[PDB]
Design an enzyme around this catalytic site. Structure first.
Site, PDB file in Angstrom:
ATOM      1  N   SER A  91      -1.442  -2.350 -14.362  1.00  0.00           N
ATOM      2  CA  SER A  91      -1.494  -1.669 -15.197  1.00  0.00           C
ATOM      3  C   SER A  91      -2.736  -2.355 -16.262  1.00  0.00           C
ATOM      4  O   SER A  91      -3.652  -1.855 -17.042  1.00  0.00           O
ATOM      5  CB  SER A  91      -0.075  -1.886 -16.077  1.00  0.00           C
ATOM      6  N   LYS A  97      -5.953  -7.566 -22.436  1.00  0.00           N
ATOM      7  CA  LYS A  97      -4.950  -6.468 -22.158  1.00  0.00           C
ATOM      8  C   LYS A  97      -4.541  -5.775 -23.377  1.00  0.00           C
ATOM      9  O   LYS A  97      -4.030  -6.105 -24.307  1.00  0.00           O
ATOM     10  CB  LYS A  97      -3.817  -6.718 -21.082  1.00  0.00           C
ATOM     11  N   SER A 143       1.344  -5.434 -11.582  1.00  0.00           N
ATOM     12  CA  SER A 143      -0.257  -5.386 -12.320  1.00  0.00           C
ATOM     13  C   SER A 143      -0.857  -6.021 -13.077  1.00  0.00           C
ATOM     14  O   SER A 143      -2.063  -5.969 -13.823  1.00  0.00           O
ATOM     15  CB  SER A 143       0.894  -4.681 -13.988  1.00  0.00           C
TER      16      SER A 143
HETATM   17  N1  LIG Z   1       2.670  -1.297 -12.229  1.00  0.00           N
HETATM   18  C1  LIG Z   1       3.547  -1.093 -12.632  1.00  0.00           C
HETATM   19  C2  LIG Z   1       4.558  -0.955 -12.909  1.00  0.00           C
HETATM   20  C3  LIG Z   1       6.341  -0.169 -13.362  1.00  0.00           C
HETATM   21  C4  LIG Z   1       5.998   1.027 -11.829  1.00  0.00           C
HETATM   22  C5  LIG Z   1       7.254   1.358 -11.257  1.00  0.00           C
HETATM   23  C6  LIG Z   1       7.268   3.097 -11.399  1.00  0.00           C
HETATM   24  C7  LIG Z   1       6.531   3.731 -11.985  1.00  0.00           C
HETATM   25  C8  LIG Z   1       6.004   5.123 -12.222  1.00  0.00           C
HETATM   26  C9  LIG Z   1       7.186   5.814 -10.879  1.00  0.00           C
HETATM   27  N2  LIG Z   1       6.728   7.120 -11.499  1.00  0.00           N
HETATM   28  C10 LIG Z   1       7.457   5.230 -10.147  1.00  0.00           C
HETATM   29  C11 LIG Z   1       7.547   4.064 -10.148  1.00  0.00           C
HETATM   30  C12 LIG Z   1       4.750   1.356 -10.553  1.00  0.00           C
HETATM   31  C13 LIG Z   1       3.850   0.054 -11.109  1.00  0.00           C
END
Ligand SMILES: Nc1ccc(Cc2ccc(N)cc2)cc1
Length: 438
Positions: free
Chosen positions: A150, A75, A174
């Site tokens: 991610s 990654k 992720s």
């Molecule tokens: N994979 C991953 C990691 C962290 C987060 C929190 C988050 C990210 C973006 C928004 N707009 C709101 C909450 C969400 C997903």
């Protein structure tokens, strides 16, 4: 499909092929297959073939190692010396890591060869993989859908057969979510079991945060187990489970804080009846199950503080250290709740996410996205609920393929086991997969 990581290793060790042919075959699959997918966005092909030759010099001199000459990617957010680590930030496109991460150093020590790195969303903060440095990764099963995030490029490279092994990171699902979306295997490991040294916000070099972990990704559980032994801080307890007969399973297809599509429920439910058919004792309720709704709130509260590094906007007052210590007390209480639950169960089976892979969204604000569940629009962010239990409370959690929905899109099953029992999570998945073939 393609050679697995272990099969590659063993081919290189029996004579069937050289590390450099292995490295060149991987390069071939990436060039022939990544055009519409865009998973391998950082490529280190020349150096990769040098280290492949070097690997062949070792084999020719008696040396063997469990991944010797095995090509793989990692990654983008994990440091490889000489390669960007940007986390998708345009300001960090040219941030070049000086030192291998610990994971990379560990797998390099085991003879692996690193061809490049795989795509990520900006700030590792989406269930998609898109950013201004590299562009967007498309789900190999349906290029109009998210590859997840991610660790989305990792999962897509695996699903498309490019490399047999990958390694990702998970603070909000992720690893599990992209493995789920792309139909491969991803192991969120016990909190603090694998070093995050080299998984650094670009141009930083500090302490690991709460919640987040690194763990391996692959097409099969055998590769996951091997990648785990090669990378954990210390050797983890081996698998105690060797049959589904009598295995105790807590099946959760409902969550008070998030819906699931009936196809996903059916997929997970079927994985549990299949185990039952081999002897498993499947339950659907238990009084020792912690309040999953409070859990989601506590996890979210702490997730946003962690990601913000304790900072708050102007006008808004930050959390005090003492209040932060109280949040860790709360987290520890909840964790003990699952300790008691695992006195009665060997694994939890539940969805990874309430939907299979969704269509690409250009909407940055999760609050403005939706997800279609059973024909109706539902809130996108609600689905963090499903991945909250293992991240917040530390447990290992496997995402493995168990089905496809009506549009052909992968559906994964989340297998949660008790802290430090990462090898039992992987072993139980392996056994779920046999059971579904039966
Ligand atoms: N994979 C991953 C990691 C962290 C987060 C929190 C988050 C990210 C973006 C928004 N707009 C709101 C909450 C969400 C997903």
């Amino acid at each position: 499909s393609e050679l697995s990581a272990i099969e590659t290793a063993a081919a290189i060790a029996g004579g069937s092929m050289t590390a450099l042919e292995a490295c060149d075959a991987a390069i071939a699959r990436i060039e022939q297959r990544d055009g519409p997918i865009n998973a391998v966005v950082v490529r280190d092909f020349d150096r990769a073939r040098e280290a492949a030759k070097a690997a062949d010099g070792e084999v020719a001199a008696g040396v063997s190692k469990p991944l010797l000459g095995v090509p793989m990617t990692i990654k983008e957010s994990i440091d490889i010396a000489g390669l960007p680590t940007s986390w998708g930030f345009a300001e960090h496109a040219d941030h070049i890591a000086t030192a291998d991460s610990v994971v990379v150093s560990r797998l390099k020590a085991a003879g692996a060869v690193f061809l490049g790195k795989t795509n990520i969303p900006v700030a590792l903060a989406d269930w998609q993989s898109s950013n201004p440095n590299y562009g967007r990764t498309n789900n190999p099963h349906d290029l109009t859908r998210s590859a997840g995030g991610s660790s989305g490029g990792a999962a897509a490279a695996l699903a498309a057969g490019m490399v047999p092994l990958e390694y990702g990171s998970d603070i909000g699902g992720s690893i599990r979510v992209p493995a789920h979306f792309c139909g491969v295997w991803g192991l969120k490991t016990t909190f603090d079991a694998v070093s995050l040294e080299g998984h650094y916000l670009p141009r930083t070099d500090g302490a690991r945060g709460e919640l987040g972990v690194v763990g391996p990704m692959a097409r099969n559980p055998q590769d996951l187990a091997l990648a785990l032994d090669l990378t954990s801080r210390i050797a983890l307890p081996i698998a105690r489970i060797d049959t589904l007969n009598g295995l105790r399973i807590l099946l959760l297809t409902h969550h008070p804080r998030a819906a699931a599509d009936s196809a996903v429920v059916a997929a997970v439910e079927k994985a549990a009846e299949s185990c039952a058919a081999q002897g498993a004792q499947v339950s659907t309720s238990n009084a020792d199950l912690p309040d999953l709704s409070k859990l989601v709130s506590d996890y979210t509260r702490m997730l946003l503080i962690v990601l913000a590094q304790g900072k708050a906007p102007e006008g808004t007052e930050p959390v005090s250290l003492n209040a932060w210590y109280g949040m860790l007390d709360d987290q520890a209480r909840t964790i003990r709740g699952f300790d008691r639950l695992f006195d009665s169960f060997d694994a939890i089976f539940c969805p990874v996410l309430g939907t299979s892979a969704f269509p690409h969204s250009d909407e940055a604000d999760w609050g403005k996205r939706t997800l279609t569940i059973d024909g109706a629009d539902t809130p996108f962010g609600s689905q963090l609920a499903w991945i909250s239990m293992a991240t917040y409370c530390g447990m290992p959690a496997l995402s493995m393929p168990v089905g496809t929905d009506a549009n052909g899109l992968p559906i994964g099953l989340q297998i949660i086991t008790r802290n430090w029992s990462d090898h039992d999570a992987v072993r139980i998945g392996a056994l779920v997969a046999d059971a579904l073939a039966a």
